[PDB]
Amino acid sequence: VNVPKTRKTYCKGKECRKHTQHKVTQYKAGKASLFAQGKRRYDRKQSGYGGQTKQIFHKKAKTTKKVVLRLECVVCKTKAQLPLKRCKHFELGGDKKQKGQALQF
Amino acid sequence: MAKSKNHTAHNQTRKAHRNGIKKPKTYKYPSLKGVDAKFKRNHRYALHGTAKALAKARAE
Amino acid sequence: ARRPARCYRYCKNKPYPKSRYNRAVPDAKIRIYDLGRKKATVDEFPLCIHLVSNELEQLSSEALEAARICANKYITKVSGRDSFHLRVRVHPFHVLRINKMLSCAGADRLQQGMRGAWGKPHGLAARVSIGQIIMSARTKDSNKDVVIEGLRRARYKFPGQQKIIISKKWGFTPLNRDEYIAKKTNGEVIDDGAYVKFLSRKGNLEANLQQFPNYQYS
Amino acid sequence: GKSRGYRSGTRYAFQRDFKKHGAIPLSTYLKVYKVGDIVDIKANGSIQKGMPHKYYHGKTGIVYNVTKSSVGVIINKVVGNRYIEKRVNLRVEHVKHSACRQEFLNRVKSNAAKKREAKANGETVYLKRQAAKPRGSRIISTEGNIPQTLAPVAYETFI
RNA sequence: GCGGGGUGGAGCAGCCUGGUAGCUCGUCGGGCUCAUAACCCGAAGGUCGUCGGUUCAAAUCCGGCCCCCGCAACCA
RNA sequence: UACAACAUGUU
RNA sequence: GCGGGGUGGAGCAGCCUGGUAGCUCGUCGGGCUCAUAACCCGAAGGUCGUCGGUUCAAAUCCGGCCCCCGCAACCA
RNA sequence: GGUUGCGGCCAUAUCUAGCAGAAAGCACCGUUCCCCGUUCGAUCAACCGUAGUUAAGCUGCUAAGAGCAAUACCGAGUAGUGUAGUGGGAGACCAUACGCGAAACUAUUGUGCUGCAAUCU
RNA sequence: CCUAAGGGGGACUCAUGGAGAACAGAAAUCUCCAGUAGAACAAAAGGGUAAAAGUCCCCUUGAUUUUGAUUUUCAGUGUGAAUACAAACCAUGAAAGUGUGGCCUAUCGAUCCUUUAGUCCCUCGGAAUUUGAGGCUAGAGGUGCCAGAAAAGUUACCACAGGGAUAACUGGCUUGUGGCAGUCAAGCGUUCAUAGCGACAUUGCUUUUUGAUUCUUCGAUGUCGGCUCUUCCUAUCAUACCGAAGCAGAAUUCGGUAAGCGUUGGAUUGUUCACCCACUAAUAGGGAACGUGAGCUGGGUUUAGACCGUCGUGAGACAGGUUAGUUU
RNA sequence: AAGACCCUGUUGAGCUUGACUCUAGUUUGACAUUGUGAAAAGAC
RNA sequence: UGAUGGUCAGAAAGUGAUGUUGACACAAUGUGAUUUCUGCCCAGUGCUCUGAAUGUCAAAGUGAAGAAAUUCAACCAAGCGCGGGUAAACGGCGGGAGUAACUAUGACUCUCUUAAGGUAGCCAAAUGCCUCGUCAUCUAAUUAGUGACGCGCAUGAAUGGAU
RNA sequence: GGCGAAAGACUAAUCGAACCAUCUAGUAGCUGGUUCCUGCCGAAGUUUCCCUCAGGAUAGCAGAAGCUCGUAUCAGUUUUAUGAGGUAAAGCGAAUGAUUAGAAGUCUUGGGCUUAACUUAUUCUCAAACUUUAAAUAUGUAAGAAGUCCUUGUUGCUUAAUUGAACGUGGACAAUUGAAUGAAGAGCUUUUAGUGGGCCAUUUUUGGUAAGCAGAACUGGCGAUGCGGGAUGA
RNA sequence: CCAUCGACCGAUCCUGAUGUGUUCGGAUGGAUUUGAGUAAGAGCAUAGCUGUUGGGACCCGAAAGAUGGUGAACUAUGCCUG
Ligand SMILES: CN[C@@H]1[C@@H](O)[C@@H](O[C@@H]2[C@@H](O)[C@H](O[C@H]3O[C@H]([C@@H](C)O)[C@@H](O)[C@H](O)[C@H]3N)[C@@H](N)C[C@H]2N)OC[C@]1(C)O
Ligand SMILES: CN[C@@H]1[C@@H](O)[C@@H](O[C@@H]2[C@@H](O)[C@H](O[C@H]3O[C@H]([C@@H](C)O)[C@@H](O)[C@H](O)[C@H]3N)[C@@H](N)C[C@H]2N)OC[C@]1(C)O
Ligand SMILES: CN[C@@H]1[C@@H](O)[C@@H](O[C@@H]2[C@@H](O)[C@H](O[C@H]3O[C@H]([C@@H](C)O)[C@@H](O)[C@H](O)[C@H]3N)[C@@H](N)C[C@H]2N)OC[C@]1(C)O
Ligand SMILES: CN[C@@H]1[C@@H](O)[C@@H](O[C@@H]2[C@@H](O)[C@H](O[C@H]3O[C@H]([C@@H](C)O)[C@@H](O)[C@H](O)[C@H]3N)[C@@H](N)C[C@H]2N)OC[C@]1(C)O
Ligand SMILES: CN[C@@H]1[C@@H](O)[C@@H](O[C@@H]2[C@@H](O)[C@H](O[C@H]3O[C@H]([C@@H](C)O)[C@@H](O)[C@H](O)[C@H]3N)[C@@H](N)C[C@H]2N)OC[C@]1(C)O
Ligand SMILES: CN[C@@H]1[C@@H](O)[C@@H](O[C@@H]2[C@@H](O)[C@H](O[C@H]3O[C@H]([C@@H](C)O)[C@@H](O)[C@H](O)[C@H]3N)[C@@H](N)C[C@H]2N)OC[C@]1(C)O
Ligand SMILES: [Zn+2]
Predict the structure, then answer these.
(1) Environment class of residue C137 by beta-carbon count within 10 Å: exposed (0-12), middle (13-18) or buried (19+)?
(2) D74, D40, D72: which is closest to D57 by C-alpha?
(3) How far apart are CA C123 and CA C181, in angstroms?
(4) Of C43, C124, C149, D143, which one has the fewest beta carbons inside 10 Å?
(5) CA of A43 vs C1' of K78, distance in Å?
(6) Cα(A15) to centroid of ligand 7, in Å?
(7) C155 C-alpha to ligand 3 centroid (Å)
(8) Residues 6 or more apart in contact with residue C210 via CB below 8 angstroms
(9) Phi/psi at B58 (nearest 5 deg)?
């Protein structure tokens, strides 16, 4: 999958509410905070005696992740997220396909 | 050891005909759900105007 | 190695031919279907005698091979190869299957029984109706009894019941003897090797008239 | 394993008729559908958009909604011990007017005409349809038609 | 219950997929030598274990009669 | 540094 | 029910990851020796078991078949 | 009635081989400054209707024509099939009773019908 | 898997074959003709498509935003997938139109937790400010046992609740396999198909083999063989009488009526079986809950002790071998 | 004698281990117990 | 294992066993009289040793930023990793081709490969499936016994070999 | 825990973890039992989900209570009209695939007068995953009052429009209100039981040599049912 | 009581007047959205049958697990005295 670095789409920002130019990047999840309630609850449950107090997932089955596109409007800087289908190889702004060329291995 | 019957429709129509098979009931005015929104929007205003015109005509 | 033929006698299954869906199918034991003087002219062998099935069953290719050899050998031995034309009129297109259960002691330990019991190709058989022709032999009228005896011997090679019928028709043609003679005297038949061609009053007039110069338009 | 996809078992039902492939004749797109019309559903395999499910192939229903390129048809489907009202959106390539309805409207018109005729003429006309009655009596002449005797024929073989 | 295997005097090809039998070891003639051994060149040599069938035609496809190596071969 | 062997039988 | 292999004459790589078939021994030519062996300078030789498919392109990926080697076949 | 433009149904309209076509229309046909498109004014674009032609397109006619379509004391009430019996037959199967009912084959016939608008020896 | 292989427009026609053109040949490129698709359309198969859905060219991002209705699976719940509209915003084209991913039918994922986007809106409850935290709407991180526990073995020391819903005997159904009998007649038999045989085929019978099945029995029908004893079957080994011969005699072979009467002694093996020795008129085959354990025996099998080999890190395993093991 | 073989049960137990989750012990560091001096390398 | 010790006990203790002890001892294992012998392998799993040399590495501590909660960084114990030893530790101890003047066999050669490729012995053995192996002996006759043979499914050296 | 010249042995007839009391009426999707009569109605072994497969939940089938009405419009049926289908049969000198035999041409296409390919007209035989054709049975819809006709009202939808669309006002058609037969009446609601092992027969049908075998379809049965008959028998 | 088109209240999306602690306020008019709402109340209390959940939970039934105690008169092993 090859996706261009720019994409003209609808912007929900109240200044636009129309198709504007967006700059496309790949979404990457932020780091897990040590002070989120769920993590503060987990640490308290794990302290003391009793061993592992929650389930740890083991039976991995998927080999891909859905790629999320981060679309930032070039006007108002509003962000939009867009998920794609599962793919093993993803790149942004790769060289476009050209057919009718003698392949030159 | 636990092999048993997989599937059958035996006796199923007999059960269905004890209290069925009932036709659905019809009404003079159908629900306008699923009807085109633009038509439904204007049909509201047409019925409203008819009521006013008939009320006025009944008044005089 | 062959099960007795009673295990595959009757047409219990839908036809199962060699195709894209069962490739590894062994060949039939019968290869030759036309025996004797197959290059003979239609006029040479007027008498036609049929061995007709009286059963709705499956005839193995081994049975067809045995019957062919028996009838051919007897008629050739008594009246020579040139006295007849014998044709097998059924082809074994049905594939038989076998489950291959081990026949030793202790087999219950190894084999799986009726689990996954779909069989492997086992042999070939022809499916025949009641009243279907199994073998046809055209010959001269003077060789009638020898051909009947040849077909009588070949009958014992088949399961079930079969009849030997003398046909009213001329050789392998679809015309009675009198109809074939009437067509012949009007110049509406020509030899096409072992068979003939008939006049059609439809189509290109000039081509038809060239094809049958002896035709007597009436 | 088993396969129960959306168009499973439609190998022949959705094929086009023999030597009837290709473009849709424009009379299909010129018919006019109104709410309350009775239409027959027939999937056209060349139009993949707005298709019926295989269940509704060959069923007949009432039009309840009219959109740009399609109609909504009401079908009654048996589910267990009762019918369920089903609502299907069908592009007009998969729909056709039902002929029995036009015949019934013909009968309504004719019946009103006859009743008006009888009214203005001073008599009464019976307007219910009737099933075929037993025939009445009749006398058959033998002029040129002397009864001819037939007998069962003997068995013969034509082999 | 039986896979399989029987081809020159011997070890092997040729089959599968019918139309045509090759090589090696050895035998006999010559070359070479003073004469040999070796080596080189030539040549003879199997109707395909036996019989019957299918076929226009069988070493070849099918089945019998001989020989052989091997394997399957109650139970509780 | 490395260097193994020379068919049989005579006159 | 299976898992591994088939590549110059021999034994082995390259396969994992499609674009040039590599190593040791062996064979052939010439040299060195009276000749041999060793040694020295040069050359040939496998379409990757077969039948197909996929691909721009197959030894390489997939399917069927042939030959080889072994694993497993338990509770009564 | 011919012809053209736009059609409906979509071979009775298609295909092969010959012949004929008055008028009008359609067509082939001439040219390249201009809008335009090509390796190529061949197609496509424009211009002239002027110089030529019914050769081709198109239309109609012909053929024991191919295909297609339709009909039937054609095959055949045959194949098949719904219902029934303490029917027949070892069985495969078969007959009967009350009903429905093919396809191939055989023979004969036919070869576009038509809507709107304009136009014509 | 695809930034096109998505969306729109345009132009063109594919597989294949024939006849031609230097190198050039069967396959290089050009030309014409035929060509209903015999091509192509990512990937299975089926459907669909020809002035196109195929090929090439030009422009694009509708693979977008907001939530509703509907179809399939269906409980008419969820998930996946799909259909037709409404309100926007865009693309393309002269335009009518078409476009809410891939021509259609598969290509996928809850609660809790984390993370990101959005209003930067709500809350931190004595009142504020700023950090931090918690909420509301929409996605992502994943459960393939795919409506979604966090999970290695062994037991031959064993336990319990049950099961004839289920295996290990007998019995029943079946009869492939085992055993036995027919039909035909290519050949063998010095000639002669059938004295005696009998290929290729083909019809049966039996339940003395072994399977297949799982109907009965798991609040138990004592589970090998031998010994002992009775009886039954006949598909007859001997004995009685006879028919046939490729019956000179002798011997032998084929067949009939026949189960009245008999069918042994031993070496090795737990053995059934097998294999030899010997006698004999002959040393036929079978059944009776694979006859027969409150009749025995206990060699084997099949508890617990022990040894070996291979396997396993190990506990241990082994229709592998070995020795000892209460018979009411 | 509510089969001890076999199977089932979201019934156990004895034993084993590179199963999951822990644990006595043991070892390693910091701080406290913990005070009084000197020399030499470092840092404000 | 030389006592500030090894092995073991206890909830703890100013607590114990060995110990009225001291390497000719105590503690922990394996093999199993004598005779004759105990081959090769430290790659794996363990056990052990070195750290002057160092990647990773907890709490405390150190530095920087910040209003602070906090964040980030550097330094950093044992361990891990790296390197050496060890089989009377657990254990292990190979394939494929060609080759001698009848044939057959293969002393001999090539090649693949291992940590090493089963040595001395022994054997159808309580260990060999095939298998009632083959030969000999024992008997009238022997799936028994014994002696031989050995590409040994799967014999073999203190998991002790042969006597 | 002990003790063990080691058998998981022994530790008071108890040992692969003693005995005693208590937690404790421990839990059991499993086995057994579950106590008077008559009357009326009366099943299910099927759907979906579940570490679900000897169990639950869910729908279905059943009972009870009724409630709103009183012939409205209903039916496991026919008739008339009008659709859909690709199974039986059929076909292959019709497409795809399979397949026997000659004949006539082309040698330009390959071994040696012609074995073979190729083309043309013929010829024998086939298909669950082939097909032009194509039943019987089964199957969708309609047969009016919520209908038809005339005139003209509403609307922000639609049309070039006074065009339409939908819903209406007013007027016309009245028991043949627009086929048959039947109708212990129609419609509506709540709530809850058991069940969720099935099995048999005709026909269709899959695996299997077959089976009192295993698995589907429609119907009728047995289960849950006695009675007359088949001697006996779900 | 039923079918249907509206109207009112809360949530969601849009619009955005007079005015202002100039960032608040939110008039007004819209939206195939959404609620266990409104639209001349129907509830509370006691009792009964049936159904549900927790409890010994219709009755009897494990193999197990835990807490605190009693045994070396049998037997195992060491020691002392015969
Ligand atoms: C040793 N060299 C030999 C050379 O001698 C020759 O060998 C032939 C050999 O081929 C012949 O061999 C042939 O002989 C005839 C053939 C000629 O038709 C056949 O009948 C025979 O079956 C076949 N073996 C044999 N008969 C004689 C040798 N010298 O050719 C072969 C060769 C290897 O080059
Ligand atoms: C400036 N005046 C504004 C007015 O414009 C309007 O603003 C809305 C605002 O209400 C919405 O805001 C909404 O945001 C979330 C949402 C989950 O409902 C809620 O937390 C919040 O209460 C709600 N009002 C916002 N999403 C869009 C603005 N235009 O409503 C709020 C307001 C204060 O009256
Ligand atoms: C008394 N000793 C006998 C000894 O005579 C002999 O007996 C056989 C016997 O076993 C045979 O029987 C054996 O063999 C026949 C086969 C030949 O048909 C089999 O059918 C049968 O089942 C089998 N038991 C029998 N036919 C003859 C006796 N002499 O062998 C067995 C024995 C025990 O050694
Ligand atoms: C025309 N097709 C027929 C079809 O009609 C039907 O035929 C049945 C036939 O099978 C019935 O017969 C069947 O049932 C009877 C009995 C139990 O009723 C049995 O005796 C008989 O063996 C059995 N074949 C017969 N009684 C009526 C026909 N219509 O089934 C057989 C068939 C060939 O398909
Ligand atoms: C804002 N657009 C509205 C549209 O939302 C709708 O209004 C609904 C209305 O129909 C709902 O009302 C619906 O549901 C209620 C029930 C929930 O109480 C019923 O009482 C009522 O009969 C029913 N129509 C009402 N609950 C909310 C409005 N926004 O009515 C049409 C509309 C004017 O276009
Ligand atoms: C007499 N005036 C009535 C007034 O009383 C009221 O009537 C309600 C009626 O609207 C309700 O009905 C309403 O809400 C029900 C509900 C089930 O959703 C629905 O049928 C639908 O939304 C709506 N018709 C009905 N259930 C009760 C009457 N009293 O509603 C307004 C009204 C119709 O004008
Ligand atoms: Zn923006």
Answers:
(1) buried
(2) D40
(3) 45
(4) D143
(5) 27
(6) 6
(7) 46
(8) none
(9) -65, -35
